[PDB]
Every structure is written in structure tokens, then in C-alpha cells.
Amino acid sequence: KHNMKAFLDELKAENIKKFLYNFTQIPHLAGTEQNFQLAKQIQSQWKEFGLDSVELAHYDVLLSYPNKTHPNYISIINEDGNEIFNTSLFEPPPPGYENVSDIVPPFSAFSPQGMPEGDLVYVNYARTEDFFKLERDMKINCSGKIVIARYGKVFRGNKVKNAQLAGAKGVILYSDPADYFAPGVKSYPDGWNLPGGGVQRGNILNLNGAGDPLTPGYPANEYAYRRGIAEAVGLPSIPVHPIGYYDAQKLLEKMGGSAPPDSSWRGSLKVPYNVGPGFTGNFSTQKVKMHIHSTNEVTRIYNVIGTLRGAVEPDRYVILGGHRDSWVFGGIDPQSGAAVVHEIVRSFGTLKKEGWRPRRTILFASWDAMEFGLLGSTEWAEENSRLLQERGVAYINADSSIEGNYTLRVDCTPLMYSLVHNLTKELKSPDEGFEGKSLYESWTKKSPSPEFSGMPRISKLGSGNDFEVFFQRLGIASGRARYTKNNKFSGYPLYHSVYETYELVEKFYDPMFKYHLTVAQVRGGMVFELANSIVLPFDCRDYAVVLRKYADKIYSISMKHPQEMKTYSVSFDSLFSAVKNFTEIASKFSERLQDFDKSNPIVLRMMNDQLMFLERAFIDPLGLPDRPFYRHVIYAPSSHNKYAGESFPGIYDALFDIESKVDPSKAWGEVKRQIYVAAFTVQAAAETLSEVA
Amino acid sequence: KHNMKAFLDELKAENIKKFLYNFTQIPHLAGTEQNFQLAKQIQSQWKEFGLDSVELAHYDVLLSYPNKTHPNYISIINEDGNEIFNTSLFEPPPPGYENVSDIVPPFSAFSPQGMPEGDLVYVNYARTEDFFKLERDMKINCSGKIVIARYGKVFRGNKVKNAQLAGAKGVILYSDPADYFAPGVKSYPDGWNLPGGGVQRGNILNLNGAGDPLTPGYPANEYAYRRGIAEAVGLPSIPVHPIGYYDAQKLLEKMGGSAPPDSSWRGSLKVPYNVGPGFTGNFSTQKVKMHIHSTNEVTRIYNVIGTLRGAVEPDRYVILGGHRDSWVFGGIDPQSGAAVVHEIVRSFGTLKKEGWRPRRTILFASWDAMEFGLLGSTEWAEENSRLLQERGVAYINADSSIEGNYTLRVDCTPLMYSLVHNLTKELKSPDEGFEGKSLYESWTKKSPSPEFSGMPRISKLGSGNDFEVFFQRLGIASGRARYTKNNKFSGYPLYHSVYETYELVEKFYDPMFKYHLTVAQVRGGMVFELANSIVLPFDCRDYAVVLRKYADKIYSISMKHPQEMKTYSVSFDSLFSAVKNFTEIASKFSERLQDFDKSNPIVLRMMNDQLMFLERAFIDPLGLPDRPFYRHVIYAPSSHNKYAGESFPGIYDALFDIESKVDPSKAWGEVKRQIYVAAFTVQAAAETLSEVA
Numbered sequence A, B: 001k002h003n004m005k006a007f008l009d010e011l012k013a014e015n016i017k018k019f020l021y022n023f024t025q026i027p028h029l030a031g032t033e034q035n036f037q038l039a040k041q042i043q044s045q046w047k048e049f050g051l052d053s054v055e056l057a058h059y060d061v062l063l064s065y066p067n068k069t070h071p072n073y074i075s076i077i078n079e080d081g082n083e084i085f086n087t088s089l090f091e092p093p094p095p096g097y098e099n100v101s102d103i104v105p106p107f108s109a110f111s112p113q114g115m116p117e118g119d120l121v122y123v124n125y126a127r128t129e130d131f132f133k134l135e136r137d138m139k140i141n142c143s144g145k146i147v148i149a150r151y152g153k154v155f156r157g158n159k160v161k162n163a164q165l166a167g168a169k170g171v172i173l174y175s176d177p178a179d180y181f182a183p184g185v186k187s188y189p190d191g192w193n194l195p196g197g198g199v200q201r202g203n204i205l206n207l208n209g210a211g212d213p214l215t216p217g218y219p220a221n222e223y224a225y226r227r228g229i230a231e232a233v234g235l236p237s238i239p240v241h242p243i244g245y246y247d248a249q250k251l252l253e254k255m256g257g258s259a260p261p262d263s264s265w266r267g268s269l270k271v272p273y274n275v276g277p278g279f280t281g282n283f284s285t286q287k288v289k290m291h292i293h294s295t296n297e298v299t300r301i302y303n304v305i306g307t308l309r310g311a312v313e314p315d316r317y318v319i320l321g322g323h324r325d326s327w328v329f330g331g332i333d334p335q336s337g338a339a340v341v342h343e344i345v346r347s348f349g350t351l352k353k354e355g356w357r358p359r360r361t362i363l364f365a366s367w368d369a370m371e372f373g374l375l376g377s378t379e380w381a382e383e384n385s386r387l388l389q390e391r392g393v394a395y396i397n398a399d400s401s402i403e404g405n406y407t408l409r410v411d412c413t414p415l416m417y418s419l420v421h422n423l424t425k426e427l428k429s430p431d432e433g434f435e436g437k438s439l440y441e442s443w444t445k446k447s448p449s450p451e452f453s454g455m456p457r458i459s460k461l462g463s464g465n466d467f468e469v470f471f472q473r474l475g476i477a478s479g480r481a482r483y484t485k486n487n488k489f490s491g492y493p494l495y496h497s498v499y500e501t502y503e504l505v506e507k508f509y510d511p512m513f514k515y516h517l518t519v520a521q522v523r524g525g526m527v528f529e530l531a532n533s534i535v536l537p538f539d540c541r542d543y544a545v546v547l548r549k550y551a552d553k554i555y556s557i558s559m560k561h562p563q564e565m566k567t568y569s570v571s572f573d574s575l576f577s578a579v580k581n582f583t584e585i586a587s588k589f590s591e592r593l594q595d596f597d598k599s600n601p602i603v604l605r606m607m608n609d610q611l612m613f614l615e616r617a618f619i620d621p622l623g624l625p626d627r628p629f630y631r632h633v634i635y636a637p638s639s640h641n642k643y644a645g646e647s648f649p650g651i652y653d654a655l656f657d658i659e660s661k662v663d664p665s666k667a668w669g670e671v672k673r674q675i676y677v678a679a680f681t682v683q684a685a686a687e688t689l690s691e692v693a
């Protein structure tokens, strides 16, 4: 028969391996001819696999590229202005790729041009708390200095934003072996570690969900009216460039001024990690000079959108999407995910060719220009927002399938917790020592929930991936899953480097492609259940549990300030009342969902609509403060780290560093305003689960 | 049987008359005990009539009242500071009401306090073009002057906004007999004209859809966090007061300075209508002094919300709503509408008691605090926005049922044109000379469409009534209907005066209550069809026709500036393309709606959802420029006159007075941006009518 087991059994590790090889032989940088060619290939193959339609959706968006005849680099210059040390112009290419054309050299996408020259300040990971330590405790002023920061811990766009606000005139990002070289493992090509010449590419935008910098709110189509560069969203104001640790060692070794304040500031290089400013006495007249000549350029991008029409509810969409554009070869990022999507499409198409169709419509997406700011998914969702908000059931992301080989990682809305627990109990574990055991069992053992015994850890969705528009802007239930390591925001060692190749994966991560297969089963199984279950597989009671946990958490933060809560009458009573009400109403809804007349399709679809619109109810059309495209009131990307999720973000940001605000009455008034918005939104969402009339 | 005819036949003129008498014996000012008592009475009666539930929804909103022991008035003061003339402290009460307590004296709600003294400038109707004429052509400066303006033509809030921007330090509004005294008719109590002591009350806010000034975006519930007065939405900055024409004649008769520029500036009083500033030579040292002592006060208001649960689609809502609060007795406004709603509820409840239920849920609303800025409907819609935007089928308004006795007036979304034409062909005309003819026939004869032969006029929805939140904020198809005169924005002569009584209606407007009955049939018949028709009674092809008319119109405005359109490459091609596409897709959708398998409830409800969400598709979540709660891209209230609808408002406002802008490149860039937003929105709405997968 045509059930989930038939779907799952059709998935093959050997097919995923073949597809991954096929997708990783040449670079597929967004906006380049080779990435358009791959888009056309995937369009062709998805049609052959059996989808009902497969179209390209193109947009013309702002991208950024180095100047091929005017290379980016950093120098140490002496008092005469001679450049006595230069950083590399390219990463040494890996074995057998030393003749591959069009490898983009390391750069920070969207850096402005400039040639700033000055003294170096070392800022650790350039986190908000690193800058607090420098300015408030150490009394070091970054104004007009070049800051050097190690990658890791937070999104690099937040590092650059923090450096700008500190007054820096340039930023140098580098990979420290403390964060990108695991002890006892060899550098690529002999292991999975970053060599000293390796460099992490990546954009440094602060888009806050806007998509293309020139067209916030609206798709970058053929008649779009663009902002000028000066009014564009999210662009950095100071030049930025990434380097590897051989080059970093040359810039850091001469540093003087203050000692590092403690050991959490010291990486693994044989240097003092002095904060500066500038170099020790003998070299005190030498300076650092950046030379950045990259250009921003409106460029065409192509999403591939495949449709498998539903038999019963064709106007309900379950979406499986992941990106296709890569920095270089994309051996892990994104092609390990794209190969998994390809095999899922192939498996669904096999069932379709035998006469089966899912209950609801499945959409498959191959997004472009993700690496330049989630641009392809966001423009597409801007174009199709009315269809998505009235018809969108769920979005399952499909970027990198592996970032390690230890255990499963899932991040998703609470609405999908039960779905994920149930699916993983039915899947086989691929782990050594768990032969014959469920994936649920291995996952729960290796990654225990911090809160509940016998349950696995499932994280909040953060951001930095293509689910952002669907979840935080539009309010469509979203999830992601991949295999992971036993630091989660720093990336694996070869992240966004030229060394991320097919060989990396086949030799060191997943030789038998069994972890890829497991991830294909999780992502595909989730899509299958969402698109085929008669009642949508969402449990509203799980949202009630987490809402109470988040309310306790935010209350606890506020309670660090008892005097102010007294003075300004700051009560969380309304939020706890709303959460209590949500808990009560969700319980009664669950009872009706279990008990309703199962022969009545209108009550069923009424109740499926209540399930589908529950995530939608947490959207506030006015957005969060100064972040209009982050509209979900329960979850937003952290204002300090785009990759991390923050709960009750409006209240969290109102409380953050409140003791430093010059007008406490105004600051605590804003805390109270955010408590009111959150209590109202939770009650309003609860009331969508009440009897409808 | 239980069909529309049974519903319509149960409606009785004599019941409407009894209810109107019952609702108009004492004042029902918002926030007063007598209006809470009436709310409780209507709640009780709607339960007795047979509704499934009837609840009060209360909010605590900013209202405004005169100070009972410190009366508002205006003076002419001489050089010594003696007050030689004072305007009235109250309207002479009508016969038999001279002992009624709690008649609020004439005032402008939300005026700040003050006692400004200065010279008078007469500004005609205080329209944007009146101020253009004064400043640009006549070179008269209103800065630090008190302006005197006649009511009429535009909403009084726009007059006050215009006066503020001209630099005025106070505004006096008065009713000129040119606008409020029809030739050959007697003053009340002997006819329907305004006496010289009559005065029009009314708020002077500029809320732009925000609702309660202190809580924009969120319901004014028990834990709401309020803006301070200084950050409140829409409050005027200068004192304002209304007077009658006996008092106006005393203020105007002494005016000097410039002659009126032409006859359109002269009303019917025996005065020169000199523009000023100030008085003629002999009285040149006399000035005008206002004394305004009204206070703004957060006050509880009560909406009555009645539910008649649908038998088949209980999660789809058809809403019939109108206000209950009045300035004084509300003989026309709103009780002629409220009495009609009461009888409609009674008729639906009679069918319900015999075992019938409508297909979809009907909600009935008695809104409070409408007169203070549509506050009750807007707060309720803010509280329930998630339910309304996913479930709201249509909103039918029910304010005043009569404003004359000549013919029918309908204003509605194009989606309801066909519904209204069909319903009125089935109803009897109440007009003399049309005995035995349809309402459609009498209406079409008396009010011909300017565009099509054999069709009646149907206007755009403007604003200034309780449909605003549902249509312009939320995008729910809305309509209104009343009997009208053969100047439509000025109001009938006794509008918002103490003379608007039950006797006014029974003696002079509708002695046999036949026009009230006809309006009950139109409003009730519309609700019946919307709540019971298997396929929703919306015709998308009618939107396509009007979109082309509005695109031609806005193109024509731009084409007054051919040189600039060349210089800045301003093309409407994308808008016309979108409208052409909408026309094509709507035609194909109509074909499918006629042809789809009529046995398939999922295709039906899929197609009913496409019909329901079509109005919703014209909403832009970012709102219009500086007016975040006006979100519909096709229709907004005119920026110059809240009562009037404007089509393609974003482009219209970008083009308005563009020749006067100091930076034409920036101004024409904004025109192009608005063309892009409108073309995109029309295409996006069209695509909601495409096949779904």
C-alpha cells in the first residue's frame, strides 16, 4: 500500500550520495551562471521525478562580490608606508581542485569599500558582553580603531553591528583554532579540521528579516522600485574582511596595551591575546591597513518551486525548502541538504507515478541567494504572502543534513513536538551501539531534555536560515532537523571554506550516507505526516507548557530588579493569567479534537483551520520595536545573535541592560507595555481555540 | 418554509416605530449611566428574541465632556476686556423636553482647554483648497488668528487639522443656513430645518483608524498600558467650539480686511463674508475670546455582541453592526438604525424559534462611543482581530436608516454590487409613483449610475462610521444602505443637534415608517444572503471593472504633469498590466465557480475561501504612509475628508499638490514607489483567484 512506510522505504543512501557528488563538483555562488545552470538541472529532474509543475521564480536582488582585478587584503604598514606583511589573496585549494575556476576568494559580503589604517583592538568574539567588558570595566575606547575579533558564539553580522556602535573604523574577523580546530584531529585533507590558510566566508548584514536590502516588504520583481544604497536595509558602514589563523597570528603577535581580562578571552594561538590598542613598544609606529574593493550589484537569482497537488485539500500547503547557492563547493552547506531534498522529491514522485497523491499540496523549494541574507526564500514569500498566510500549514527547512555524526538535532515550534517524538520512535537509529533501537532511543540517550526525564532536547527556532520569513514574519509552524556534534553557533571547522567538499563528507562525516538517510527519513516523514494526516499533527497543549516556562523565565529576569518593580508597579499577573487561560482552553480543544464527530468534514476542517491558524495567532501586525518583519510575539531571533532564538523577545529586549538606562520611568514603562502586548497576544491566541460560536 | 421571503415578511414598520420611540426618550451619551442602562436592555431583549448568546464587551477609553460648573462659550471683548457679547450656553430645548436632564451642551469633543483671544479670519469650509486660496492667492496669514469656519463638505476633524497647520490658535465652527436651512421649509418644531439657536456637536479627532487615542493597536482592556496624553493619537492642539447661526451672525457681521474672493465663499446670512483678519475700523480694537474647559477622561464603554450560531459553517461570521451612543436623543443618528437592527434580530429570532438556523454564524453588534471616534467597534475588532481576519465574511453597517426620503443610498465594496442589484429587484419600492414597482426600478430612476445606463449609483465606502476597522484595517467586505435626499457630507439640517428627536422622524421624515422598513429589508436581506447562500454572493468580476476605472483615473491625474513623467520615467504600465491580469483571472475563476462539481463541499469551501479572502488580499500589512491602520491599497478615507473614499490612495496622495514640492525627484520617486505597491497588490490579489495548485 501507499503509506508512510512505502515513502520511507523508497529513500536510498546511495541516491543521496550520487546527488551530493553531482551537486558539489563546481562552485554554485548565487548570481553566477553555474548556479543558474544547476537551477535548470533541478527543475528538469523534479519534472522527470513526477511533480505536477516545476517553475523558476526569479528576482533581481542586491548581491556583493570581490573585484577580480583589485583584490581584498590586509597589511601591517611601517611608518614609511611600506607594507611589510600582507594577508593571503586566496585559500590554498584542496587536492585535485587546484585548477577549478571561479572559486570566490574569502571576503565579507556587503562590506563597503575603503582603505582604513589604524591601531588594532582585540575584542574577543565581539559580543555585546565583550564590548561591555572593554568599555565599562577596562575603559578601552574602540573609536577610530580597527577591531580584530574571533569568529564564533554569535552571528558575524551582530559582531559587525557591535563594532560599528563602539566607533570602530574597520573589522577583521578570523578563525581561532580554539573554536575551529578540534584536539587530536588532522587538518583537511587528512581530517576535518581547519588549516591555517582556511577562511570562513559569510555575509555581515543586519536585515532583521527584511530580505533584499533594496525592496523591504515587496518582491524584487521586474517593476520593483528600489531604495537607493543610502536607504538600503542592513548594510554595514565600515569595511570588514575575514582571515585564517596563520594570518591572524601575524596580526596578533605584536599586540600591546592591556592584558586579556581573563582566560575566556584567550584562544589557542601562541600569542598573549593583549587587547591593545596598538602594538608593543618596538613596533608601536606600525599600523594595520585594510584594502576592501568589493562591490554591491543588483543581480538575478532563481528559486526552483515544485508542486505536488493535494487530492483532498489542494489549498493547504506543506512546504519543504532549502537553499542551493553555496559559497564554494557546498559539500556540507547546502548540498548535503539539497541532496536529501532531491531524494525526498524522487520518493514522493515514485508514489505519485503509482497513482497516489498526498491529502494536502506539497511544495518543494530550492532557494537561491540564501548566503547573501535569506534573499530567495524571503522575496518569494513577499510575492506569495497572501497565499501563504491563508493556506500555509507548515514549513520544513532543509539546509545542511550533517554538522557532525553524534546525534539528531531538532529545532521547531512546540506544535510539532509530538509529531517529532512519534516519528522518531518509528525510525531506526543509525548510531553504533544502537543497532535495532529507535532513533528516539539513541537521540534521547545522547541529547537528554534538561527539563524532562526520558525525553530528548528540542530547541527553539532561532534564525539565520530560510524558515525565518515563514515562521517569524508569517507565522507558519516551522521545523528543522539534522545530524549534529556532541559552540553550536560557531559552525563545524570547515564551515564556508573552500575545504567543504564532497570528499570531506564521504571520507570524514558520513561514509555510508546513513546519517544523510536518517535525516531524509526525519524531514520526509515530517512532510508526509503534515501533508497526509487527516487531523493536522499539531498538539496545542505543548505550546501551553512552553509558554509557562517562558513566562517564568522572563519574570525571573525582571525580579533581579525588585526595587524598580515596586516603584513602577510592574506586574506579570496579566501574562500568567493569559498563559493559565491558554492552558485551560488548549486542554478543552484537545478534548473536542479527540471526541468530535469523525464523520463531519466541516468540523474536521474547522478544527484543522484552528490548528493551522494557532501559530498565525502569535503574529502582531505591528511587529516588534524597530524590527517590523519580526512579528511573532513569542519567538524572535536574539538581538545579540541572529542564530539564537529568544522567547518573549519584546519583554526581553525591554529588560536588557535596563539598569544602564538614563530614564528608568520610561524604560520600565516600556517593560510594562511589552508585558501588555504579550499577555494580550497569548490570550488572543488562546481564544482562537475556543468554540467558534 | 424558512427562506429569505419568510425573514423579510416578518419585519414590521410598527415594530421599528415602537423601538425608535423606546430608544429616544432620554439622552444616551457614551460613558453615561443611561447608555449603560440601554446596553443592558438591548442585551436582555436580544436574549428574549432568541439569540444563542448575548454578552457585553467593555473597554476603558478616552472620552471628552464639558465641565458642568465651568461652561464653554465665546465672547467679543472690547479694549478694556469687557465681554460685550457671549455665545449661548445651551440650545433652546424642543417642546416637551425643556425639563429633560443631562442634555450635553454643544461642544467639540476632545478640544484642549484654553482661553485664546485674538482676531478672526473667515476660512469658508476650512478645506485644503480654502487654505490654499487664503495663503497662496490672497496672501492672508492665519498664524496666531482665530479661524471661523462653516460646517459642511468635509469632516470637521479635517477642518481643525487644516486650521492647525495654517498656524491658527483656535477654531470656531458654525452652521450656515446655506448648508443647513433648505429653502421653503420651517425650522424645528414646525419643520425639519435648523433654527438659529441649533448647534451641531461632534468630535474633532484625526485618528486615522487608530480607535482609542491611548491604546493604538490593542484593546483598551483591564490591563492595557496607556500612552500619556502627550503621545495620544489624533488629539487637536488648539481649542475648538461649535455655534449656531444667530451667534455666528454676531461674530461675522463686524468682519473687515479682504472681501470674499468669490461667491462660493458667501453663505446665506446677511453679512459680507469678509475674510479678515479682524473687524472693520470702528470695532478694530475688539477681539474674540474663546473659553474652553472641557476635560478628557478615561471612561468605560459597553458594546452588546449577540451571536446566532451557523448550522453548517459556524466558523464563518456575517456581522450586522451599528452604534447605540448618541449626542442627545439620537432620533435619526443612531436610533433610526438601532431600531432597524432590533427588528432584524427579532425577525431572525422568530425563524430560529421555529427550528431554523442560518448556514453561517451571524453576529449582531450595538457599538458604543462611536460618536467619540468609532471607539467601541475599533476596540472590539482590535481584541478579536485574529478571529475576524480568518473567519470574517462580511460586515453590514447600520447607523441612521434615513437622512432624507427621496431614494435609496448604498455604499459598498464592488464584491457586493451584484448582491445589491439582485436583492433590490426583489423588494417593493416604498416611493410615491412607484406603487407595484421594484426598489431597483425606483432607485435606478432617481439615482442613475453616471457610467452605465439602467444601473443605479453605488458609491465607494468612505469612512466616519463603524465599518472602518473591518474594511480599511482588516479587509472584510463591507456595505451600508440608507434612505437619502436628492452636499452628502454636510449632514441633514438637525444633525447632532438637540432637535434630532422621535418627533422629527415621525412628523417630517417617515410618518408610516415605510422607509425604515425598506432599509430593514435591504440590510437584513443582505445579511440573510451572506449568511445563507451556498456559494458566497460576491462577484469578483465587478472588482475588475472598478479597478480599471480607478487606474484610468489615477493615470489621468498624473498626466497633468507630462514633463515630469518624461524626466522621471513614471510609467503606469505595471498597474494596467496587473488590472488586465486581474480581469483575466477573475473571468476564469467565475467560470470555475459556475462549473465546479456542486456535490463537492471541499471545492465549494475552497472556492468560498477564495471569495472571502479576496477583499483580504488588498490589505498591505505595512499600511499606507504615516497611516498604519489604513491598510487597504485600493480604498482609504480621503486625507482631506474622512467621510469621502479615495481610490488608489497611496498614489493619489503622492500626486496631490506635487507641483508645490521642493524636491521633485524625491516626490516623483514616491509616486513610482506607490505605483509599484499598487501594481503588486492588484497582481497578488488576482493570484488568490488562480487555481490553488
Ligand SMILES: *[C@@H]1O[C@H](CO)[C@@H](O[C@@H]2O[C@H](CO)[C@@H](O[C@@H]3O[C@H](CO[C@H]4O[C@H](CO)[C@@H](O)[C@H](O)[C@@H]4O)[C@@H](O)[C@H](O[C@H]4O[C@H](CO)[C@@H](O)[C@H](O)[C@@H]4O)[C@@H]3O)[C@H](O)[C@H]2NC(C)=O)[C@H](O)[C@H]1NC(C)=O
Residues within 6 Å of the ligand: A574, A575, A577, A578, A581, A679, A680, A683, B055, B056, B057, B058, B222, B223
Ligand atoms: C483569563 O480568563 C478569564 C475568564 O475566565 C478572564 O477573566 C476576566 O477578567 C477581567 C479582570 O481583568 C474581568 O473584568 C472585570 O469585569 C467586571 C464585569 O464583568 C461582568 O460583566 C461582563 C460584561 O461587561 C461579563 O463579560 C462578565 O462575565 C461579568 O458578568 C467589571 O466590573 C470589572 O471592573 C471593575 O473592577 C476592576 C478591578 O478592580 C476595576 O479596575 C474597574 O474599575 C471596575 O470597578 C472588571 O473589568 C472579566 O469579568 C473576567 N471575565 C470573566 C470571568 O468571564 C481574564 O481576563 C483572562 N486573562 C486575560 C489576560 O485576558
Ligand SMILES: *[C@@H]1O[C@H](CO)[C@@H](O[C@@H]2O[C@H](CO)[C@@H](O[C@@H]3O[C@H](CO[C@H]4O[C@H](CO)[C@@H](O)[C@H](O)[C@@H]4O)[C@@H](O)[C@H](O[C@H]4O[C@H](CO)[C@@H](O)[C@H](O)[C@@H]4O)[C@@H]3O)[C@H](O)[C@H]2NC(C)=O)[C@H](O)[C@H]1NC(C)=O
Residues within 6 Å of the ligand: A055, A056, A057, A058, A222, A223, B574, B575, B577, B578, B581, B679, B680, B683
Ligand atoms: C501579468 O501576467 C503576465 C503573465 O501572463 C506577467 O507576465 C510576466 O511578465 C514579466 C515581465 O515583466 C516576465 O518577466 C520576464 O521573464 C523572462 C524569463 O521568463 C521565462 O522564465 C521564467 C522563469 O524564470 C518563467 O516563469 C516564464 O514563463 C518564462 O519561461 C526574463 O528573461 C525577462 O527578463 C529580461 O527582460 C527584461 C525586460 O526587457 C530585462 O529587464 C531583464 O534584464 C531580462 O533581460 C523578464 O524578467 C515574465 O516571464 C512574464 N511571465 C509569464 C509570461 O508567464 C505579468 O508580469 C503580470 N503583470 C504583473 C503586474 O505582475
Ligand SMILES: *[C@@H]1O[C@H](CO)[C@@H](O[C@@H]2O[C@H](CO)[C@@H](O[C@@H]3O[C@H](CO)[C@@H](O)[C@H](O)[C@@H]3O)[C@H](O)[C@H]2NC(C)=O)[C@H](O)[C@H]1NC(C)=O
Residues within 6 Å of the ligand: A418, A419, A422, A537, A538, A539, A594, A595
Ligand atoms: C503521538 O502518538 C500518541 C500515542 O499514540 C498520540 O496520542 C493518542 O492519540 C489517540 C488518537 O487521538 C488517542 O485516542 C483517543 O482517546 C480518546 C480518550 O481515551 C478516545 O475518546 C478517542 O476515541 C481516541 O481513541 C490516545 O488517547 C492518545 N494517547 C495519548 C495522548 O497518550 C498522539 O496523538 C500522537 N501525536 C500526534 C499525531 O501529533
Ligand SMILES: *[C@@H]1O[C@H](CO)[C@@H](O[C@@H]2O[C@H](CO)[C@@H](O[C@@H]3O[C@H](CO)[C@@H](O)[C@H](O)[C@@H]3O)[C@H](O)[C@H]2NC(C)=O)[C@H](O)[C@H]1NC(C)=O
Residues within 6 Å of the ligand: B418, B419, B422, B537, B538, B539, B594, B595
Ligand atoms: C444575481 O442574479 C443573476 C441572475 O440570476 C445571477 O447570475 C446567474 O447565476 C446563475 C447561477 O450561477 C447562472 O447560471 C449558470 O450558467 C452556467 C453557464 O450558462 C451554467 O453552466 C450553470 O450550470 C448555471 O446554470 C447564470 O448564467 C447567471 N446569469 C447571468 C450572469 O446573467 C447572479 O449570480 C446573481 N448574483 C449573485 C448571487 O451575487
Ligand SMILES: *[C@@H]1O[C@H](CO)[C@@H](O[C@@H]2O[C@H](CO)[C@@H](O)[C@H](O)[C@H]2NC(C)=O)[C@H](O)[C@H]1NC(C)=O
Residues within 6 Å of the ligand: A021, A022, A023, A025, A040, A041, A044, A045
Ligand atoms: C549531474 O547530473 C545531471 C543529470 O544526470 C547531468 O546533466 C546531464 O548530462 C547529460 C550528459 O552531459 C546531458 O545529456 C543531460 O541533458 C543532462 N541532464 C540535465 C537534466 O541537465 C550532469 O552532467 C551532472 N553533473 C556532474 C558534474 O556530474
Ligand SMILES: *[C@@H]1O[C@H](CO)[C@@H](O[C@@H]2O[C@H](CO)[C@@H](O)[C@H](O)[C@H]2NC(C)=O)[C@H](O)[C@H]1NC(C)=O
Residues within 6 Å of the ligand: A081, A082, A083, A084, A085, A086
Ligand atoms: C604587499 O602588497 C603590496 C601591494 O601589491 C606590495 O607593495 C607594492 O610593491 C610593488 C613592487 O615593489 C610596488 O610597485 C607598489 O607600489 C607597492 N604598492 C603598495 C600599495 O604599497 C608589498 O610589497 C607587499 N608586501 C609584501 C611583504 O609582500
Ligand SMILES: *[C@@H]1O[C@H](CO)[C@@H](O[C@@H]2O[C@H](CO)[C@@H](O)[C@H](O)[C@H]2NC(C)=O)[C@H](O)[C@H]1NC(C)=O
Residues within 6 Å of the ligand: B021, B022, B023, B025, B040, B041, B044, B045
Ligand atoms: C423601553 O422598553 C423596555 C422593554 O420593554 C422597557 O424596560 C422594561 O420596563 C418594565 C417596566 O418598567 C420592566 O418591568 C422591565 O424589566 C423592563 N425590561 C427591560 C428588558 O429592561 C423600558 O421601560 C422602555 N423605555 C421607555 C422609555 O419607554
Ligand SMILES: *[C@@H]1O[C@H](CO)[C@@H](O[C@@H]2O[C@H](CO)[C@@H](O)[C@H](O)[C@H]2NC(C)=O)[C@H](O)[C@H]1NC(C)=O
Residues within 6 Å of the ligand: B081, B082, B083, B084, B085, B086
Ligand atoms: C458674558 O459672560 C461673562 C462671564 O460670566 C460676563 O462677565 C462677568 O460679569 C460679572 C457680573 O457683571 C462679573 O462679576 C464677572 O467678573 C465677569 N466675568 C468676566 C470673565 O468678564 C459678561 O457680563 C457677559 N456679557 C454679556 C453681554 O452678557
Ligand SMILES: CC(C)C[C@H](OC(=O)N[C@@H](CCC(=O)O)C(=O)O)C(=O)O
Residues within 6 Å of the ligand: A155, A202, A203, A370, A371, A372, A373, A374, A399, A400, A463, A464, A465, A488, A489, A490, A491, A492, A495, A642, A643
Ligand atoms: C552553522 C549554523 C550556525 C549557521 C548555518 O546557517 C548559515 O550559515 N546561514 C548564513 C546566512 C545567515 C543569514 O544571512 O541570516 C550565515 O550564517 O552566513 C545553518 O543554519 O546551518
Ligand SMILES: CC(C)C[C@H](OC(=O)N[C@@H](CCC(=O)O)C(=O)O)C(=O)O
Residues within 6 Å of the ligand: B155, B202, B203, B370, B371, B372, B373, B374, B399, B400, B463, B464, B465, B488, B489, B490, B491, B492, B495, B642, B643
Ligand atoms: C452624516 C454623515 C456625513 C456622517 C455620519 O457619521 C457620523 O456622524 N460620524 C461621526 C463620527 C466620525 C468619526 O469619528 O470617524 C461624526 O462625523 O462625528 C453618517 O455616516 O451617518
Ligand SMILES: *[C@@H]1O[C@H](CO)[C@@H](O)[C@H](O)[C@H]1NC(C)=O
Residues within 6 Å of the ligand: A067, A068, A069, A070, A295
Ligand atoms: C575593479 O578594479 C578595476 C581595476 O583597478 C577597475 O578598473 C574596475 O572599475 C573595478 N570594478 C568595479 C568597480 O566593478
Ligand SMILES: *[C@@H]1O[C@H](CO)[C@@H](O)[C@H](O)[C@H]1NC(C)=O
Residues within 6 Å of the ligand: A141, A142, A143, A144
Ligand atoms: C572615545 O574617543 C573619541 C575621541 O577620539 C571620543 O569622541 C569619545 O567620546 C571617546 N569615548 C570615551 C572616552 O568613552
Ligand SMILES: *[C@@H]1O[C@H](CO)[C@@H](O)[C@H](O)[C@H]1NC(C)=O
Residues within 6 Å of the ligand: A192, A404, A405, A508, A509
Ligand atoms: C565521526 O564519529 C567518530 C566516532 O565517534 C568520531 O571519532 C569522529 O570525530 C566523527 N567525525 C566527525 C566529522 O565528527
Ligand SMILES: *[C@@H]1O[C@H](CO)[C@@H](O)[C@H](O)[C@H]1NC(C)=O
Residues within 6 Å of the ligand: B067, B068, B069, B070, B295
Ligand atoms: C470644573 O470646574 C470647576 C469649577 O470652576 C472646578 O472646581 C473643577 O476642577 C473642574 N472640573 C474638572 C477639571 O474636571
Ligand SMILES: *[C@@H]1O[C@H](CO)[C@@H](O)[C@H](O)[C@H]1NC(C)=O
Residues within 6 Å of the ligand: B141, B142, B143, B144
Ligand atoms: C505668518 O506670521 C508669522 C509671524 O507672526 C510668521 O512666523 C510666518 O512666517 C508668517 N507667514 C507668512 C508671511 O507666510
Ligand SMILES: *[C@@H]1O[C@H](CO)[C@@H](O)[C@H](O)[C@H]1NC(C)=O
Residues within 6 Å of the ligand: B192, B404, B405, B508, B509
Ligand atoms: C419628504 O418627502 C416630501 C415629498 O417629496 C418632501 O417635500 C419633504 O421635503 C420630505 N421630507 C424630508 C425630511 O426630506
